[PDB]
């Protein structure tokens, strides 16, 4: 991108019959940012051609203390094994200042540590952007003075999305700070609670709960989300019909338009 | 694929050898030169006797005319074709029938028009092209009734399926005869092309390029010739076959075009055709557009004999022999009228 | 068991004959006659 | 394609059933009920040997015969205008006869090794007989199929040679080189079949 | 007892019969009426 | 030889990238004498830290050697663009 | 002491030798008769000569008859299995070989009949090619016979 | 001492002989009758000669009828199995061989009968070829008779 | 003392005798009827003669009906197996033979009626050809009866 | 089998009948034959299912 | 000790190598020969250059020979089974890989000859493509040899 | 401690990887060569650019060679079965995935080469589709590499 | 207490997830490339914005890669079988579901690009339709992710 910008005056003042170069040139300022942010995220991902960047701040574990923790001459058996570094041994811990600790770039199980992050992060970021996109609709509905689009639309729509999907995001952060390796066995499963949430499935045992009273919260949120649907589903066409008879309006077609909006909105939120 | 080169020779083995042996007998460039160096029709006969042609003008009228040579040339190849067509089995016979269909289509156009303008069938049949044959009755003794010919076609004539586009007789009376024949031929091309693709082996790859060429050629020429006549652009498009390279995009531009230049602009997107329009100098004393298409078509039909296990050799054979006749007649006609400077307008067929 | 030595071996030899028979019969079925004769 | 559709439907059902049965045996943790060694060991080596011998001779004839019709029709057809063809192009059929011979010699050398066993319980009986038995099957199969496809090759090529020679007598000699390669393909199968049974014994 | 025999017999007997019916039924199911004589006019 | 300035230009960019990456790699080998942890150790591996330090220095030298080839290539390709 | 089913393989050989050979000759016969019927219309004088492919097809059928009978006359109850497989091989060997030879006969003869009518100089070439097919069939007989004593 | 279910193969033989021979005759009959219907409309004077293909097809059916009956009359309950394999071989040998002959009959009949109308001199050639198809069928009968009494 | 499952074969026989012969008659009936419809438009005067193939096909179905009933009335629980095998054979013999006859009937009826429409002299030859198909069906019945009572 | 018989003859019969009214009686007879063919199945089933 | 039957798989390997390689070479050879004959009719001067594809095919045949011979010489009765599986894998690896290569040889040579007949400048291009197909066959040989000696 | 035939699954992997990859590369090579031969006649100057699909295909073949060799080098007799299944999975994953990639290379090359001749601007687009196909092949290699060391 | 073969089911899941997904992407890529090449003849300026079907086809392949990695990392020796069946279901679910998506992406992409050539307004519509096809792949991934963690 820097090249294209530095040659911007020379590229403009010539013929460019190659449409492939023209396209990327036209987006050259878009690409510039693409690179700059890719650098930022790559540094946190700590991957430069599959190489991490060790700043001598990697204190994830203290191998000398690994041997102290009842590992005497393990490198003899090690000749045929790996051996996973234990959590909460009393001698390991502490976050990496910026990005993922370089140690994981040389692990055989990065394929669970790092993949877990990216999955959960993707959900968090996606939902937030979705909520932002909905928030913007409020300014537009106000600008055009459509009270109905906020009293029967925005409000139940944002509650619908928040109550189901924002709740999930909170729980993801909650577990990270709520549970340590001390409870890694039978540790709560975020996906299972999320699915059981929607289904009102509350087994007596088999899954640990994230917090006391969660069952009441799970039921409440789903009921509200469902109660949000009538608002967006039927209140606008119904009130418009009333306004017709009071003031004196294709009621049937209006119901179709609103129903399609509701159906696509709710199903699309999930997808 | 492994589709050919296995069962092909079981029934078609004999004919494949025969038809290529017949191809070997086509006039070569060396032979055409000997025929050009005549300037006399009787000398032309003598030079023809040097090849597989000859001794077919024997016992004819002492005065030798071009019209006689024309009829005799067709007759020779018709016999050779019918011989191969008769000694053949359904797997190939159906393919060959499509070839005959092209001639039958013209012949049934002759049966109508005359029937529509009260002419007797017996008067029309003598001017039908061979291979039409129509040995069936009901098409005969129609009593100059269009309905009787229409029913006879639907029932006995193999072309009945194609007439589904032009039906109810109303079409026969209200449509221009030329739109009717162009519509029927389109149906022929569409079915025949698909048939070749059903035989999805060597034949499809060797045969379809030629059929696709014809479809695109007709789209080009029709568009140009239609400029100066009375024809709706939509009705013109209705005659453009969909079995070609213009179908995806290109026919839409020809359908809208109102000028030769716009037609060429379409060709510009297809180098295989662009070269033909550029070669067609169209000078007052040069080759024209139709001539370049004929040269291309022959090139393709010659390449057909590069595959030894397909049906396309039989189609190519017929077309190459027909051009051979066109070449020979042209020479005879140039002699009769003494236009020696125009003698080198034959299409070499190797 | 589902199969014995006897039954199994019998099946194997049967298949060889079925494969040959199938081939032979296939070629026999794919036999056509002429639609018309060339001339008098 | 009525017959091809039938053949395919049987083919798919045949293997589809094997897939279901095989996976089920695994799923239900059957005690190795599907025992390949049992199938191979109970099947008399005499069956395997005689199958290979019949295949070696029979498949080789199929090839030769296949090529015979490929070039026969082309030669006869072309000769209608070029009767000279029979002078030289008949060698293709000689090539096909040679392809058939390959299998005949191998089949006889194999059959010459057949002997009785007077054997019953395979356990520790005929250890060598099983090896020789399987080898005879393989060598017979090896040469049979090799000659089968050899004969088809030389037939296809000979057809092209006849079609070329019909139009230009100068082409035959140069083209003939290809048929020689075809013949070599069959010979290679012979070499391996000989090796496979080169060190076998019965009794 | 003798399962392998009853099994072998019944499977291959019913397989041969079932296939004969399937093929025979197909051939009739797909009987070609000729699509001529009166069909061209009715079509 | 000209060879085409479009192709010489590609070499110049690849050569510059190569020298930058290879020198940095050799440095990392010398500093962490490491994340890559692929110095081709022996299977008969003893308790001798000096052995891996020696391997890392060798790899670093190899990186600088390869960079030298790109330095020579960049000069050649550069002059081709200038004369082209 | 005789493995049961030992007689099954033997009788199967006799069956195959006859059935496959008949199939081959029948295939050749059908093709030859079809080509002859088409040829004879124009040149009836060639009808007698044109029969040869059919007689040749018939040899392929005899080849099979010889083995099928040889095997049948060699069957007993207390068959030692070894002998049975030898008979099975002989049956299969001549069967498929005769079948393939019959196909070559039919296919070549069909083309040959048309070729001869158009060019009688092809008559000998037709015979020579089909002569190979007849040898192909004899080969099958020879091996089938050899196995009977091994 | 006699194997159980031993009668199964002999019973299948008797039926197979009848069924396959009927299949052969049926094919030859249908094709010959088709040629007759197509031919004799132009030359009805041949209608009484073109029937022969059809009669000959019937011979293949009799071939099968004779063996099927001979087998059935040879079956009992306490069969030594050996005999049953022989009965199955005889049944299949004549049935499948007649089946092949039926195709030769049918195909040659159609081509010959229609060709004969175009060229009456073909009549002799047609019969000779069809005679060869009858010979092909008889070979199967011969072997079946040898096995059925072996 | 009776083999379990033994009744399975006899029961399949009673069914097969009817099912396969029904398909045969169905083919003949359907194929002939199509030709009749085409004929009658050209000339209805033959409508009372062209029916003959159709009733003939039905006779084939009866052939099977007779055996199917004879077998069904011969079924028992304490079956000796031998008789069960014979019943299976009889069912296949008549069913499959009638099936072949059904195609023989259908093909010749269609061609015969269509031809006769153009050439009334074809009628006599048509009847004889239909007779051969009926005889082919009878041969199966004969063997099936011999087996079922054996 | 009877169902196939009915369908094939019905198509040809009905189409022909419009072409030729005289076909009606022949069509019915043919249809009757197919129905009789089907009955045969019922008869055997009734006899067999009660044995 | 050395289990029985263990040599079975190794025998299949030696056979598979040769048979599948022959398949590839035979197809590629037939395809090349067809194209060569087609060209030479138009112009004989290119015949020598058009031969290479046929040698290319023959190499596939050798690929199969090298492994088939290596295994066939290695085969014994007392095989430790592990070695037999290696032989089976080596046989399949080279045979099936060479088959794929020979197919490409056939397709590319045939198309290359027709193209070259029209455009002599194609000579180098088609040969380069054929080189990749030969490499594909070699890869097969490489893996097969590694396994057979493992 | 280990079961028998445990190497059976692994060795099939090494073979499968090479064979399927050769099948994929061969298919793409054959289809590309056909398009190259046909195209180059009209546009000979593109002969050195239309070769690329063929190189792409060879990559799929290498992909397969690498895994097959890695399995072979890790293929032993005393395999723990667990490891053997992993090797088979790695072999199948790269082989069958490369086969899918070869299909795409084949079709895209065939259409792309001709499309480019009619439209030089298509060249870059053709390459990108080819790069996507190479990425598809790599995906299989990646999984195989993960499994082979797991 | 861990059932043998349990790891077989497991590893087959990881492979299937990759293989079927690659097949889907390969099909969609092959069809998309064909349409693009033809389109480029008339409207080359549309080539760059016509790659989308091909990229989308790719992600289907990735969805498969993702599951294959998740399973491959999850594979162990002492697998409790239950986990293995979850892995097998996860593998098949994403692979076969993506395969179905590959057809929709390919078929729609071809029609969309060809249509766009004449109706540039189709672009948003092409995208809307393709998105739904991608969703099919996503749904398969969702289920696979749920199963692998259950």
UniProtKB/TrEMBL annotation, chain B:
One of its GO terms (cellular component) is lysosomal membrane. InterPro entries: ATPase_csu/dsu_sf (IPR036079), ATPase_V0-cplx_csu/dsu (IPR002843), ATPase_V0-cplx_dsu (IPR016727), V-type_ATPase_csu/dsu (IPR035067), V-type_ATPase_csu/dsu_dom_3 (IPR044911). It is found in: Cytoplasmic vesicle, Clathrin-coated vesicle membrane; Lysosome membrane. The keyword Disulfide bond does not apply. It comes from the Eukaryota. V-ATPase is a heteromultimeric enzyme made up of two complexes: the ATP-hydrolytic V1 complex and the proton translocation V0 complex. The V1 complex consists of three catalytic AB heterodimers that form a heterohexamer, three peripheral stalks each consisting of EG heterodimers, one central rotor including subunits D and F, and the regulatory subunits C and H. The proton translocation complex V0 consists of the proton transport subunit a, a ring of proteolipid subunits c9c'', rotary subunit d, subunits e and f, and the accessory subunits ATP6AP1/Ac45 and ATP6AP2/PRR. Belongs to the V-ATPase V0D/AC39 subunit family. This is V-type proton ATPase subunit.
UniProtKB/TrEMBL annotation, chain D:
The chain crosses the membrane at residues 6-28, 48-69, 90-114, 134-164, 171-195. GO terms for cellular component: clathrin-coated vesicle membrane; proton-transporting V-type ATPase, V0 domain. Its main location: membrane. Signal peptide: none annotated. Pfam families: ATP-synt_C (PF00137). It is found in: Cytoplasmic vesicle, Clathrin-coated vesicle membrane. One of its GO terms (molecular function) is proton-transporting ATPase activity, rotational mechanism. InterPro entries: ATPase_proteolipid_c-like_dom, ATPase_proteolipid_csu, F/V-ATP_Csub_sf. It is a multi-pass membrane protein. Keywords: Hydrogen ion transport, Ion transport, Membrane, Transmembrane, Transmembrane helix, Transport. Residues 51-110, 137-195 form the V-ATPase proteolipid subunit C-like domain. V-ATPase is a heteromultimeric enzyme made up of two complexes: the ATP-hydrolytic V1 complex and the proton translocation V0 complex. The V1 complex consists of three catalytic AB heterodimers that form a heterohexamer, three peripheral stalks each consisting of EG heterodimers, one central rotor including subunits D and F, and the regulatory subunits C and H. The proton translocation complex V0 consists of the proton transport subunit a, a ring of proteolipid subunits c9c'', rotary subunit d, subunits e and f, and the accessory subunits ATP6AP1/Ac45 and ATP6AP2/PRR. Interacts with IFITM3. Belongs to the V-ATPase proteolipid subunit family. Proton-conducting pore forming subunit of the V0 complex of vacuolar(H+)-ATPase (V-ATPase), a multisubunit enzyme composed of a peripheral complex (V1) that hydrolyzes ATP and a membrane integral complex (V0) that translocates protons. V-ATPase is responsible for acidifying and maintaining the pH of intracellular compartments and in some cell types, is targeted to the plasma membrane, where it is responsible for acidifying the extracellular environment. This is V-type proton ATPase 21 kDa proteolipid subunit c''. It comes from Rattus norvegicus (Rat).
Automatic annotation (TrEMBL), chain F:
Belongs to the RNase K family. This is Ribonuclease K. It holds the Pfam family V-ATPase_su_f. It is a multi-pass membrane protein. The lineage of its organism: Eukaryota, Metazoa, Chordata, Craniata, Vertebrata. The chain crosses the membrane at residues 8-29, 59-83. It is found in: Membrane. GO terms for molecular function: RNA endonuclease activity. One of its GO terms (biological process) is proton transmembrane transport. InterPro entries: Ribonucl_Kappa, RNase_K. It comes from the Eukaryota. Its main location: membrane. Keywords: Membrane, Transmembrane, Transmembrane helix. GO terms for cellular component: membrane.
